[PDB]
Amino acid sequence: PIVQNLQGQMVHQAISPRTLNAWVKVVEEKAFSPEVIPMFSALSEGATPQDLNTMLNTVGGHQAAMQMLKETINEEAAEWDRLHPVHAGPIAPGQMREPRGSDIAGTTSTLQEQIGWMTHNPPIPVGEIYKRWIILGLNKIVRMYSPTSILDIRQGPKEPFRDYVDRFYKTLRAEQASQEVKNWMTETLLVQNANPDCKTILKALGPGATLEEMMTACQGV
Amino acid sequence: PIVQNLQGQMVHQAISPRTLNAWVKVVEEKAFSPEVIPMFSALSEGATPQDLNTMLNTVGGHQAAMQMLKETINEEAAEWDRLHPVHAGPIAPGQMREPRGSDIAGTTSTLQEQIGWMTHNPPIPVGEIYKRWIILGLNKIVRMYSPTSILDIRQGPKEPFRDYVDRFYKTLRAEQASQEVKNWMTETLLVQNANPDCKTILKALGPGATLEEMMTACQGV
Amino acid sequence: PIVQNLQGQMVHQAISPRTLNAWVKVVEEKAFSPEVIPMFSALSEGATPQDLNTMLNTVGGHQAAMQMLKETINEEAAEWDRLHPVHAGPIAPGQMREPRGSDIAGTTSTLQEQIGWMTHNPPIPVGEIYKRWIILGLNKIVRMYSPTSILDIRQGPKEPFRDYVDRFYKTLRAEQASQEVKNWMTETLLVQNANPDCKTILKALGPGATLEEMMTACQGV
Predict the structure, then answer these.
(1) Do the chains contact at C30 and A59, CB–CB below 8 Å?
(2) Could you say which of B60, B65, B67 has the minimum Cβ distance to residue A35?
(3) Three-state DSSP class for A2?
(4) Tell me, what DSSP letter sits at residue A93?
(5) Which residues of A touch B57 (CB under 8 A)?
(6) Do C38 and A15 touch (CB under 8 A)?
(7) Which residues bind ATP (chains A, B, C) (predicted)?
(8) Which chain A residue's Cα is nearest to B55?
(9) For B107, phi and psi rounded to 5 degrees?
(10) Helix axes A36-43, A17-30, angle to 10 degrees
């Protein structure tokens, strides 16, 4: 990564083995779970493209997903090149070259080049552009690797509501829809797939009800 | 978090992976248990809102609770906005803007903004405001996720008193009532749900008795 | 390794025991698996030839492979000497000597000599030359130590496609062919060795189909 030194300049320092291993261990343990994305984001703080390929290349397993991601990274990169055309005429001696999708992916650029772009004034955030592609591609994966739809979430005849509400906001946690739609899902689908005995109870709370009151309301059921 | 550097200034430094993992592991192991709250509090020392969303977003599992908390955080935030109205006229060039509920929740503010408020003179403790909302919402959860009432705590016919007294101050540990009420519960309910053989014993100690003397008094029973 | 000090110079520092042990543990656990190569590459960041012989010499087990590698390192070294002849006349007092294959392999050079070449201006990347030989020799090993050909990958009569597609991009992950050939393998061999029931399904998707749609298409089968 590129970090600030004591002297007050930005210099490159290598990433740590127990950081590396922590990246490995996350993937081992939580596979495609959503917590992987904030986790990634923290461990990618101040990271280079080069370090990001290192992290992706060091994965073992889940090769269908790893290929889907690659292909997303190239699509997003192809899109970078499309949206940002190359600039007019020859490159100035006094200046350094604009990046392409493949420089952002780290492929066509060298480390010193990656440090030039980020440390220079204005700086360009080629990490953050790759980061969105990774996060976007992470959404693709998460959405695919979900095994059950939100409509299929229902309360058992003997299942406590509580255990059901947990299941609901876990699956709701894997839905990516607008907040307004997710509000609609909350007031609607939760009660609808609730069991008759609690359903009866919840109808008596009326509208305007909040989760602690619903959760304490269906406790004996 | 925002920490003090050697030079004698407050600067931001990132939180550590084995700190992150320790947060994860606590949640894995002790779920909704009360020890989670002091634990949280220690690991949240000098933490930003941004770091607090990171910690909440990196949870896996217990999604009913995670949703209840979210909704508590927004309620407490809505309440911040209600209680503290926006201020008179345009924002001064010489000054920085007052926070809203969503800046406290970290949502509408940037990191540099979160560092402005905390490092500036006077400083404003937006961490500690979110912290109370988290702790308050933690009480809501703890109280809900308790599975047994204090009145339901009783001593077996063959159960040592000792094992019963442990159960009592564990459940008493999940009651949040005034101290005076909890004193009333101590002298009253403990003896009342104690078994006849020990109950008999405890009646002979009279009033004024302390726990070592009760605990040594019902030992052979 | 040779690392940059705080003062702003490149100085040698020793490699760490839990780095050493992490190298050991990788080899213990993942043997000849491809993830070993990025892993190696990260842990070899800023490393000397001397440190690279240390890492190779500290292996236990897999001695047939260790000998194959040695012999690859010497072949690649023999090739270095062939391609780069020694230079004209005596060595200048003002200059330091050009390396041979054996200096790159660390054998004929001393540490201070390895630091002279790398720290000097222009610097020569004798690590990166040995690194390619190691990676090249790693490909030789990986390809040999593969136990099954890509043509032998087929879908069971009761095996979910999904479990088969995972097997395919794992074996495809051990093929080293041009991308165009690997594209040809993707569209061709995958469907061809797919079972009749899913094969039927996949024929109905037509061409132009992508992996999420194939993977959701053969789910009930």
Answers:
(1) no
(2) B60
(3) strand
(4) T
(5) 35, 38
(6) no
(7) 18
(8) A38
(9) -65, -50
(10) 170
Give me the amino acid identity at A153: I
Contact status of C148 with chain A (Cβ, < 8 Å):
no
User: Which residues in A lie closer than 8 A to residue C19 (C-beta atoms)?
Assistant: 17
Of C8, C22, C173, which has the smallest distance from its Cβ to A17's Cβ? Answer: C22
Mutate one of B67, B74, B141 to test the A interface: name it (highest A CB count within 10 A). B67
Cβ neighbour number for residue B107 with a 10 Å cutoff: 15
Instruction: Tokens for C56, please give them.
Output: 């190779």
The residue type found at A39 is M
Residue that the structure tokens 């040698």 belong to: C12
Distance CA B112, CA C65 (A): 54
Q: Which helix (H) or strand (E) holds A117?
A: helix A111-119
CA–CA distance, A207 with A220 (Å, rounded to integer): 21
Contact residues on chain A for C169, CB-CB shorter than 8 A: 63-64, 66-67
Judge: C6–A11 Cβ closer than 8 Å, yes or no: no
Other CB atoms within a 10 A radius of the CB of residue C94 amount to 5
Count of Cβ atoms closer than 10 Å to residue A18 Cβ: 14
- The 3-state secondary structure of chain B, one letter per residue: CEEECCCCCEEECCCCHHHHHHHHHHHHHHCCCCCHHHHHHHHCCCCCHHHHHHHHHCCCCCHHHHHHHHHHHHHHHHHHHHHCCCCCCCCCCCCCCCCCHHHHCCCCCCHHHHHHHHHCCCCCCHHHHHHHHHHHHHHHHHHHHCCCCHHHCCCCCCCCHHHHHHHHHHHHHCCCCCHHHHHHHHHHHHHHCCCHHHHHHHHHHCCCCCHHHHHHHCCCC
DSSP helix/strand/coil, A10: strand
Q: How many CB pairs under 8 A join A and B?
A: 66
Query: What string of DSSP letters covers chain C?
Result: -EEE-TTS-EEE-PPPHHHHHHHHHHHHHHTT-TTHHHHHHHHTTT--HHHHHHHHHT--S-HHHHHHHHHHHHHHHHHHHHHSPPPSSSPPTTS-PPP-HHHHTTSS--HHHHHHHHHSSS---HHHHHHHHHHHHHHHHHHHH--S-GGG----SSS-HHHHHHHHHHHHHT----HHHHHHHHHHHHHHTS-HHHHHHHHHH-SS--HHHHHHHTS--
Q: Report the neighbours of A using a cutoff of 3 or more CB pairs below 8 angstroms.
A: B, C
A22 touches chain B (CB under 8 A): yes
Q: Report how far Cα B212 is from the mean position of its chain's Cα atoms.
A: 30
Q: Are A137 and A72 in contact (CB under 8 A)?
A: yes
Q: How far apart are CA B138 and CA C138, in angstroms?
A: 53
Deposited experimental method: cryo-EM
Cβ–Cβ under 8 Å, residues A55 and A15: no
